[model samples]
Target: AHALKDPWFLSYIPQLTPDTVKYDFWNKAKQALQQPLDYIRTVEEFWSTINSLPKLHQLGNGSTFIFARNNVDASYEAFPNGTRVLVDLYKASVAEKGMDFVLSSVLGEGLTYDVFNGKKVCDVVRLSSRPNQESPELVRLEVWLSDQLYAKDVIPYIRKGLNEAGLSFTDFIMGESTF
Candidate 1:
């Protein structure tokens, strides 16, 4: 039998629309009901939620969703103390595969924890638009790190995790510079 699935929260951060331009990402995140719209615990529930969503190609450019650990909120306010590891990818199709790779590696194979000596080094990973507002087609993988000191050490592991998962990226950023 398969191992018991880890409970994960499913949250959505809508793409900033022209009419909702007044609300910044933080405000939008806060105003969203329940933060995570749903809490998924089983394989069936996971697929149900995934199937319920609109097709990837059909969604708006910056439409964002996250599958974070049960205890971690995918919002900035929830994580105030730790640094983050970021993997930015260009193009829409590439970004989709990249997010899938990172999420699966961390949650399924325990990539982050294994690299950090079974410690909870990172809890949340997200894929969304790049810092350049003009390039809405670009998406980046944001991996939140619990310790700044271990930031350098875990970089290689993240790279290895991606390659092991059959995904490759030119580079990854190690600092947090929110625009």
Candidate 2:
């Protein structure tokens, strides 16, 4: 029996979409058996919830998510929206889980990207693994949205969401300004 025929993989067909097949061939194989194809609707709803969140800045490029920070450095100029930070915070977060290395890496990447792009605003989301080492989930996300688009209007809603998501704003030390 082929691994693709595994019942476990086949069970998720209803939840898989055309995009999923591009990444997972097994999913594509099962697409034929998938009924009604409600995956698009589910995905759309999920994205809608994410986009609707407060302070959720959607970059026209559709490549990254943004989470802003409070600290502003003179040397490190602001970044524009749609900047992609190189550091993989998600990997770091999952690797360490308890340490702030992931968050630090994210900030570092954002700063680097900002400098590289020569922009004054950044729309990037820094996702940190949950403090709960056992689960090691994405505990927090920091988005830096352009003030020109949405300022105070988004902060409160984002704060509420973060708080509800079990994330806290602890002391995050920024590296020396690069400017």
Candidate 3:
């Protein structure tokens, strides 16, 4: 529909092609974000068709899926090649599809990255909700990937509030942008 033709996701090709879309999610996230083990998601809304999960709208990572459905039952039975999740990682991390390339994407499109001794020293995928919330599910998932040095300052408080909102420390893994 709207997304397939216009490409709502940053990872998607603006001009629809047969394989460009799947080339990002099916080939990228499954190999990058540890999606097979580290990722979890809500299983509704065509769980069979949703190529990826828990996208962040706050960061303007707006995305949608294109599925062939029965329409009468309101369930999805097909996942086209283009359906995908927004690439939420930085270019430095993602360019190689290594553990390094797994942070905020698109937004990290052209922003500068400070490298270190040998690797990118700072990277964090922040999954949080708004203030004054009690449960993680109480709000839309806000996934942010930060590479700037200031991440430490804002992240501590962001984690604090999200902690009060019920996210465990183990819920996230830290990374450094030494690159």
Candidate 4:
């Protein structure tokens, strides 16, 4: 349930807990998930929601948009976390116009830490490891500066990141010691 990101499917059992579960728990989760459908009051809303999925896309357009949240599917000394990739594609010279199209490497600019809404979640004794719960990844607000990464804009951002790290690529690599 957790891996699927909709473990809220297990949300109904307000009384649910680690050492306990029942059909009622399952039912609540299922019902909770269905309610999002109730909020879809229009055809446009429905299409907008489904279009977010790459494979299930139906825009009739030629290009494709793919979304993914990589998994450790293997982590011991470390726990994995949220969707992490952001690529502002579509029309660079004509944003707001081409703003809607993008093929993100992660989900948002999911790399920057202060962008998303859902961050405070974690098993605190081990905060640094849980990227999945930290809303610190993608903020999703970036647009193409000029159909691509413009030097003046992109360079400064990259430089800031490097300068802040105060290290070369090899030195910046996070190892088990990062914990």
Candidate 5:
């Protein structure tokens, strides 16, 4: 009886601390997102690349993908809080046409965010339902960047890439960090 619970799959139960179990599960889930599905692997590839990119901080609470930019300045007052940053990025992506299309085709419709400050950002093409106890129907895509990197650089390139790919601008919801 004891040996049954000691099987390899069950072994994880004893060895895992509460925090590490959550982290390990999330890390595996994140990795699983990259596996090829169907003939097209858009989500997988997109996330795989995202995983490779450097992050100041990251958190996956099963419902969200939170990313934050690195802060080089030792005296900088702001810490890299992933949620705020992702919300901002989500807003900008919704505003563009091509990027929207790509996100829509890949993720399906109903992409939106209930931001931390009680702001609601919606994708023009679809209405996302409110998240409840159940996992959200939509996958959250979060990005954090410094104001300089985001305004002066990343947004434009994202727009251009979507255009080149013939994807709509309203397809995905992105969140940005204000810090």
Candidate 6:
């Protein structure tokens, strides 16, 4: 009964491994493709993936780790059908809270459906480096909506969810990646 009912893909982009603003990391993420690390279909497997690997905070400054549903790549082009809730970590300190909320509540608990009568909304979420920012350590969290919802509709749920998780609304924004 623990079946997630959807296969979630995990991937990493190492292009940010060396940061230089001259190159577009976003374009690189889209065209520079690689297979996902693996897919998980159960709660047990999800925890194993989360607990066994390097925690989100431990990832290198220039790299990103993505947990997306249905093999969706970590790119805007692939997820063009729906809105994205961009959570840019204003500081490095809240990365842990942001990571916890996305993983535990959004993905693990499927809180994205809080307003959808238990029906899921979003399928993809990502943790990527905030390149060319004041702090290289800062990161951005992205949650991609499914075709069924819009950003305005889904944003309230995101705000409530984050607030419930103890994150202020100032911690995030209603926009897409500038890259």
Among the numbered candidates, top TM-score falls to 6
Q: Which regions of candidate 4 deviate over 4 angstroms?
A: 1-149, 168-179
Question: How accurate locally is residue 170 in candidate 1, as Cα lDDT from 0 to 100?
Answer: 51
Clash pairs (backbone) in predicted model 6: none
Give all TM-scores, in the order shown: 0.69, 0.23, 0.23, 0.17, 0.29, 0.71
Counting clashing residue pairs in each candidate, in order, gives: 0, 19, 23, 13, 29, 0
lDDT of 2: 0.30
Q: How far in Å is the alpha carbon of 61 misplaced in model 4?
A: 38
lDDT of 4 by residue, 63-102 (tens): 2221112211112223333211222212222222122222
What global local distance difference test value does model 4 have?
0.24
Candidate 3 Cα outliers beyond 4 Å, as residue runs: 1-9, 12-147
Rank order (by lDDT, best first)? 6, 1, 2, 5, 3, 4
Model 6 lDDT per residue over 1-179, tens place = 38775778887765455444356455654456443576877888887776665544465565667787777655556555666678777655566666666776656645645655576666777777664445555677777766535566566666677678777767655455332
Q: Per-residue lDDT tens digits of candidate 2, residues 1-179? A: 11110011001122233454576664234435332211111324333433343221121111122233332221114553322222221232222331233333233342324333434344334333223343322233344444334333334433333344444444221211111
Angstrom error at residue 150, model 1? 2.7
Model 6 CA deviation exceeding 4 Å by range: 16-35, 53-61, 131-133, 169-179
lDDT of each: 0.60, 0.30, 0.26, 0.24, 0.29, 0.65
For model 4, the run of ten residues with the poorest summed lDDT = 122-131
Which residue runs of candidate 1 sit more than 4 Å off their true CA positions?
1-5, 16-29, 33-37, 43-58, 131-136, 168-179
Measured on C-alpha atoms, candidate 1 has an lDDT of 0.60
